[PDB]
């Protein structure tokens, strides 16, 4: 195996395929990247046994076929550390892989390509293409609502669903839920899968924010995404995930509309004097007015009064202010609509100008 490639043609791919690797690999091979030269292409692959990221790099300089695995962090750091424009010559020499550039030389230890973990073959059952920007929107709109190491391991991931002509994501941790739907232009078979936490992170990382379209393939137990010369594949999480349609408040009769930023800034200031652990704030809704109050164990108190559009009966309701701020931060809009029922029921929050995303937050008893 032999290849010579310009530093920058190699750097981003190395960075990307290293994504799924941890700071401390359980076993040596998991800290390595698989390098394969075949048919004028160098392929780089990184894995954590649950998912893998592959990059294809075109070789325009002389090369020889073959494969090996070498330490990912070390190889990336070497390439990144070389001068801009450096030519990086690489050759497999049995127990070691020799990297040369200028008068810089590096000998890395190798592990057999035959020993590199490989995800089982699988078949795609649904396929579609969508703009990278749509995938980014879908994930960013709901990722914060995923559980963090919950017993219901399925809540630690994100649900991806195809319906009619839309792709939708759903995340929930039992206290709040986020759902976002986006049209795809294609007619798809109704489908529902759970993508693991690290999988969601990798999907986001592979979006360059360019014109390259995103091609998705979903099987019974895997999801694959292709962008440019990168291919990400992850196993899916098994389990039964909640039906957002049922979690949404049944009859949120009371509707309030308010500027997103004024509401966010008021909650942010009130949060300063809320209980450091429980973070509770009180909302008192009255005709065209919202009063937010917060108090803590030190007898400190914050009060914010805001003009809003509201005509229902008066009511008071408590919330974890961090859950509310998380939603307002995810909604990048001018105005928001809060739909309430009563003090003991969940509230649904959405962009006042779009039903694309919806957030359900359960209240707390102050």
């Amino acid at each position: 195996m032999k290849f010579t490639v310009e530093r920058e043609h190699l750097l981003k791919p190395l960075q990307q395929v290293s994504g799924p690797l941890g700071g401390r690999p359980t076993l040596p091979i998991l800290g390595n990247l698989l390098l394969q030269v075949a048919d004028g292409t160098l392929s780089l692959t990184g894995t954590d046994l649950e998912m893998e990221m592959v990059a294809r790099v075109a070789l325009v300089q002389p090369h020889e076929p073959g494969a090996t695995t070498v330490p990912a962090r070390k190889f990336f750091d070497i390439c990144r550390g070389l001068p801009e424009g450096a030519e990086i010559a690489v050759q497999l020499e049995g127990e070691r892989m020799l990297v040369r550039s200028g008068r810089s030389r590096f000998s890395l230890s190798t592990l057999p390509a035959a020993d590199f973990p490989n995800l089982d073959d699988w078949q795609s059952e649904v396929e579609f293409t969508l703009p990278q920007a749509t995938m980014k929107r879908l994930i960013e709109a709901t990722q914060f609502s995923m559980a963090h190491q919950d017993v219901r391991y399925y809540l630690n991931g994100m649900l991806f669903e195809t319906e009619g002509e839309e792709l939708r994501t759903v995340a929930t941790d039992g206290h709040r839920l986020a759902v976002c739907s986006m049209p795809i232009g294609q007619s798809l078979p109704s489908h529902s899968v759970i993508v693991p936490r690290k999988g969601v992170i990798e999907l986001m990382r592979m979006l360059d924010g360019g014109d390259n379209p995103l091609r998705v393939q979903i099987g019974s137990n895997n999801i694959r995404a292709h962008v440019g010369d990168f291919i990400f594949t992850s196993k899916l999480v098994d389990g039964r995930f909640p039906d957002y349609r049922r979690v949404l408040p049944k009859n949120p009769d009371k509707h309030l509309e308010a500027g997103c930023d004024l509401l966010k800034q008021a909650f942010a200031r009130a949060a300063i004097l809320s209980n450091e652990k429980f973070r509770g704030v009180r909302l008192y809704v009255s005709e065209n007015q919202l009063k937010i109050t917060a108090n803590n164990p030190e007898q400190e108190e914050a009060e914010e009064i805001l003009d809003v559009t509201y005509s229902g009966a008066e009511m008071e309701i408590g919330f974890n202010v961090s859950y509310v701020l998380d939603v307002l931060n995810a909604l990048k809009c001018e105005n928001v609509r809060m739909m309430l029922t009563d003090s003991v029921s969940s509230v649904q929050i959405e962009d006042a100008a779009s039903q694309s995303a919806a957030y359900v937050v359960m209240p707390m008893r102050l």
Partner: peptide
């Protein structure tokens, strides 16, 4: 004092 959703 946090209540939970009916998932």
């Amino acid at each position: 004092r946090q209540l939970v959703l009916g998932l």
